[PDB]
Symmetry: C7
Amino acid sequence: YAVNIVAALAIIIVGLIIARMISNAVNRLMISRKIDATVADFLSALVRYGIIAFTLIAALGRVGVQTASVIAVLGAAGLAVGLALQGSLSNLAAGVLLVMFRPFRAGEYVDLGGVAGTVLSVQIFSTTMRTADGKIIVIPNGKIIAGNIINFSREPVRRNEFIIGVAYDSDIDQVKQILTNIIQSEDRILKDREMTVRLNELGASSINFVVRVWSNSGDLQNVYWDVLERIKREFDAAGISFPYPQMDVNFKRV
Amino acid sequence: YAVNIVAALAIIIVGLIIARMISNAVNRLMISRKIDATVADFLSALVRYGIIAFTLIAALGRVGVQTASVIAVLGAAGLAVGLALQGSLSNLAAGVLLVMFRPFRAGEYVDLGGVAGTVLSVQIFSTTMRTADGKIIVIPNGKIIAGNIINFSREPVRRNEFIIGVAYDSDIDQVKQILTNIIQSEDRILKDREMTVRLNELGASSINFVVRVWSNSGDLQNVYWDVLERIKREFDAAGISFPYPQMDVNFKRV
Amino acid sequence: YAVNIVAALAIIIVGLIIARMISNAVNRLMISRKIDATVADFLSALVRYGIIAFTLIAALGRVGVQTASVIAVLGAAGLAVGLALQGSLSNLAAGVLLVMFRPFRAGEYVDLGGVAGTVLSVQIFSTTMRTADGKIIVIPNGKIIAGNIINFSREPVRRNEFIIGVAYDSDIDQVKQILTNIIQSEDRILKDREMTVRLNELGASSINFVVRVWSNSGDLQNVYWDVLERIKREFDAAGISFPYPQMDVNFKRV
Amino acid sequence: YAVNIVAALAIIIVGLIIARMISNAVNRLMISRKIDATVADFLSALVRYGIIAFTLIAALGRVGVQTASVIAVLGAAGLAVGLALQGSLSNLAAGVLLVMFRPFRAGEYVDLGGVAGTVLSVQIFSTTMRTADGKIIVIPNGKIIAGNIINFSREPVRRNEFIIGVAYDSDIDQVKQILTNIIQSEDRILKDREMTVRLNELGASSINFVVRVWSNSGDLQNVYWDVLERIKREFDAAGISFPYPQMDVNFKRV
Amino acid sequence: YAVNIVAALAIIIVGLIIARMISNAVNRLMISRKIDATVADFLSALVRYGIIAFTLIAALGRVGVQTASVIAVLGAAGLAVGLALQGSLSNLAAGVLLVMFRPFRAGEYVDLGGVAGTVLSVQIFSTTMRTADGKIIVIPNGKIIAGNIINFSREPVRRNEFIIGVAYDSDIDQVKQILTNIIQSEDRILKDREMTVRLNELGASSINFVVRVWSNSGDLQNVYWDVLERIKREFDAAGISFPYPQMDVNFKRV
Amino acid sequence: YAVNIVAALAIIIVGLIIARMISNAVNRLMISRKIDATVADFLSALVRYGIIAFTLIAALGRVGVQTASVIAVLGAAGLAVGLALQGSLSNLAAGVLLVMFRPFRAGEYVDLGGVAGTVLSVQIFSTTMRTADGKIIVIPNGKIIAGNIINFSREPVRRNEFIIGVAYDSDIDQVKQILTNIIQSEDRILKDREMTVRLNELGASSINFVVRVWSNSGDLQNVYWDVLERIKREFDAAGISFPYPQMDVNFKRV
Amino acid sequence: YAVNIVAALAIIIVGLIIARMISNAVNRLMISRKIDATVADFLSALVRYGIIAFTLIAALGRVGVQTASVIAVLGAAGLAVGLALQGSLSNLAAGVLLVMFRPFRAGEYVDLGGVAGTVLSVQIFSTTMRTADGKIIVIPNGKIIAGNIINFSREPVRRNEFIIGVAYDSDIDQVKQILTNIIQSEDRILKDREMTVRLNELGASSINFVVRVWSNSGDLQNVYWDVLERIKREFDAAGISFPYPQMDVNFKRV
């Protein structure tokens, strides 16, 4: 009877010294690893309150008090902390998944669901990537894994799609001749792949030719800019008119 | 009383020699399987902390301290890891579902909810597919199973829909005659299927004929381009005018 | 004391032979039914690891070690696999619900929440349906049950709605006379149902008559196309003008 | 010792014969009710595997093996089936709620969050409703309860809102006189309720009068069509002009 | 030994008679209060199956069979019914909270996240409200509590905002004089509150004055209509022009 | 044996009298605090059913239910109530957060994710706030914590941004001179802060100057209105034209 | 027998004095910390009711009444409070994550998914940040972690993108010469990085040159404004016309 009481006080004193030991130990461990001391002491007070809660419940169990009430409420409070940390630990799990199944490496130009940039680093909780215009975007890993990963650096060839609106009076064969001469005289265009120049659309004010052209993934934007400037030059020289928005107006004297 | 004593320490030392050996074993196993050697030791430290937690709880239970507090908090922490890994393990389950119920195979041109490409591979956690313009999209499997799978390589015949806007003054029977001559003289159009040429819409500035035409799944875009170019040529030759946006203007000199 | 040790090793050996024979049996059942070998051996390794986990826990319990730690973590790992498989087993439950409460059968042209096609088959995890333009859409059953099911093959008679924009100067009674003559002389229109021709809207540039017309579900699109072509013909013959977008211009010379 | 073994084999044989008899009984109970046999045999195999799992667990417990691991994993698999059936059983609960608290009955024209039609039947898992244009929409009950229920057949009177755009030069008092004569000479308009004819908006090209008019729920669309046709007739007769889109243009030079 | 068997059959017979009496009593209670019997018989069959399940597994426990596997599956089926009834019970909890914290009473014109109407009644599961145009909307209580409650009947004074577009040629001080004379000569406008007449915006074709004016919550729409009609009258009398959409057109004849 | 019977009937009678006492006390406390007799009687009936459920189970346990059948079902029914209560008391937790972290509690004009107004009161489940146009919006606290809080009375100085579109013929230095004279002669503009007058955009028909100007949080709307009216006055006085939507028009033949 | 009754009353009295002392102690602890007593007494009454509930259940267990029913309902109520506090404790966990993995510090101009401003402080539950236009936005931490963190202060160099629309008649080489002279004569433009001046687009009415220019993060907006004003000045001096929206008008003249 009193043996359970002295055993319970023994559990209390060993639990308090273990609580102070583990609390100060994780204080030292987060001062050494991390930098902050305020939230380190906050988490250390959380762990200290956890160990003294564990040992107070174990002591009230050693006395003989049926202790399942605080067991159920402490389990639901741990489950509260669990459904809280669902997002952060999901970022952790997506991070280890994204570094063991790696669809991008540090330097691969990707498009992670609406933002596109070169991956500077894949950390444990987030990938830092630098945008094309200098912005640093720190995307969490759950937002990456839960969406698509459009990797632009895994295939060495990509495809420019030019859409040229010419007038309806413009001859289809002359436009196709000039566009084929432009995309054939250009050296960075892969000739062994698709080189489509065909009438894509009968537009409202114009008529739209599509020019689908494969090139290297590094020369892609320069092929777009050079073939577009050459299209403008050769079309203005050859008399083919890029039309303005056209209206037919039926005038009426009131 | 002493039977619980150092026999509990025998449990706590038979557990540490299992914890270290299982940590070293999963380090060697994941170095053999998928080398990272930097989050591999983190997962090994997680498994080590789990096994030493199991054996510390079992040793405190063998002594006589009623362990149901750390049991409930460890179960809630396991459920935290569970609701964390909900997304990744749902990708795994959707991957084994997608490879045992396979709606696409490696090479089938599909459309998985807004992105469309040829599936290069269906891995365990993601399908890599190459877009029509060269981009590699690594879609997770839960995002595929949670949405539609529009497969273009399962049926060998598909349907082009042309919408030709002609002027309101143009004769309906002449447009239907010329469009039927275009879709009948074209050989890749399946003649035993639907060949609809009918007045679809009375538009604002135009009047829209629909041309629904069945052709083979490989010949489909070429049928679209050739029949559209032939429509432009034969309509310009026959005098039917594709109209511009039309306005009726009632000018008022003020 | 040692009786529990030899009993624990007995549970160990019967569990290892059970872990071999159940894994071999599910390899048999997955090679015969739903044929695959790689992910079938993956699932077999999962079932083998599960059975050896069950029997290692049972052996450590039969020895005398309080084993509730791995019980709670294994229950939370089962709950991890459960909240993972939530989506796939919800597709399973929605599939058996969709086939025992069947709102569509194999062949019924439906509209399952933004995609519309004829249901080729209702499988256990997904309905395959062929779109009107040849595409095969494999919709999961949870996405079908969680949204509406617009069935076009359940009523034999449906309703075309024409909206004819005529000019503001056109006589309302002449337009109603001509539209009623068109929808009365057409034989596939159900005359015993609603045949509405009334002035629907005072539009911006036009004035919109509505023509609500009931006809059979197979003849519906042909009734639409024939009555629309007849509307264009008879309105052009009778002098009623479908107007262009109208502007009133008050020009004032700066 | 061996008494527990023969008792365990007794539980094994009574559970196997109970599993076979209850699988045959649930097969009869489904084939009499829902006359699909394939998914009936699937659910029967599920119930058979569940009861033989129950009795294998009970036998391994009666032998003396601590059968807590398979109980925890089986409870988590029951929770897998539970979070799976969350959607379908939520449709069931919303169906019994929607038929015991019934905001619509079979025949009542409603608008269940988007789609709008007359409810043909409220079943247990879904309400079938027929749209105004003939389409059958089978809406699940959770989608109905989770959204608004805009019931049109609960109140016998409703309100038409005409918006008449007249020119800026038109006299406000003459428009209000003519609109009040139109909405007063019409007999299906409830005269004891609100009859608003007032200047609602100073539009861009027009000026918008609102006409808010109460009438019976069956006469509502006919009141709209007749008062709109009368508005067009009397406004064209009295010289009030529904204006086209108006532009003030300041002409300039090159 | 046989004492447990006769005790188990005793629990069987008392549980079957309690199951029949509670099933028939719940059926009678759902007849006298919930007149529909087609789902009352189903709910009573559910309660009957539940009580016979409880007493069958209680008798299987009283025999001596370790029964804690069907306890886990039954407690997961109860949690299936729980996560099913999550929506309906959330409507019940939001209803009792919406009637003990009442932000609207029966008759108060509100806007419950989108739809807006006068609350006819707040029931336990839904608030019925009549729209301004006669429609009856039965909003569930979880959708009300989860969103905003814009109550228009809690403050007796509200604010009209007129936005008058005048021409750029119009004098600012004359427009402000006429608008201030209109909003000062009007008696239902609260003169002790804000009366703003100031230049709000330099629009594309016009220039927009804002007139923010406080008036009583019942007189608000009539103040809007009377001040807008007076603005049109006084501005047409004073020569200030409400401008049409303006274009500056540069002639480029060739 | 019969001692457990008389003890069970003792538990029955003490539980029934405690049920009546606690239900009467809860009805007293609810008719004192949160007065509504109908739903307080409903909640007291729920608490009465709960206490008679607890005591019927606790009495029938010793003569019966054999380790937690009805307890395992009642715990899941408690969690059924608990998911409803998590949806509702997420507002209570957010309310005690919103009071102990005090982001707007005094009456500060804020913008709580969309709607914006002066906070009338922060209650326990909702913040009532009065909009700028008189509407009372009762936002729940979970909707506030789940979104941003844009507090306008936390910083005493804020920023007006004028965007002035002038013509392309306007001299940039003259526009910058006049705008700097307007924003320098105005006394409520903070001159020690940013005063930006620079060419923001080359518009389609205009050219847009940005005027970023810091002023006090009370004087800000009056600074906007006064500087905008002064911009219109001085720009019309100095010959700088606010352009209409310009449109170069190239004439053609029929 | 009576020893359990006097022990139960002992637990009752020690739990009541412990409940009063912990309730008043957390009143004192919060009044020292956060000095709203009105919710401090609310939380203190919650903790008092929790401790008296724990000790009432412990006393009913020490008497001998099987008390697992209220254990299950109290655990489900703890899970109700936990899943209610899910969002608040997720903000807490995201706050300690955001301060131990800090992607922004106090002062770093960021864009936290939409809103963008300089982070004034990162607290435990929210980050306060001041917008560029003076507004104070208190973003919760879970909303920050759940989205991207676009940090503008981590890289010292960023990129302006000018899009200059010139006329179609303008010479491409003259525009590229003038734009290269502007972006080369400007000193704050980083010349060792990308300096792109190339033909980006053939627009509808214009033709769009892109000018991608790298400059320091503090000089970025001033580089944009200075190069845009210089583009307007030098282009008007050199005769290059920024075109208005262009229409081609075909006179039909009825």
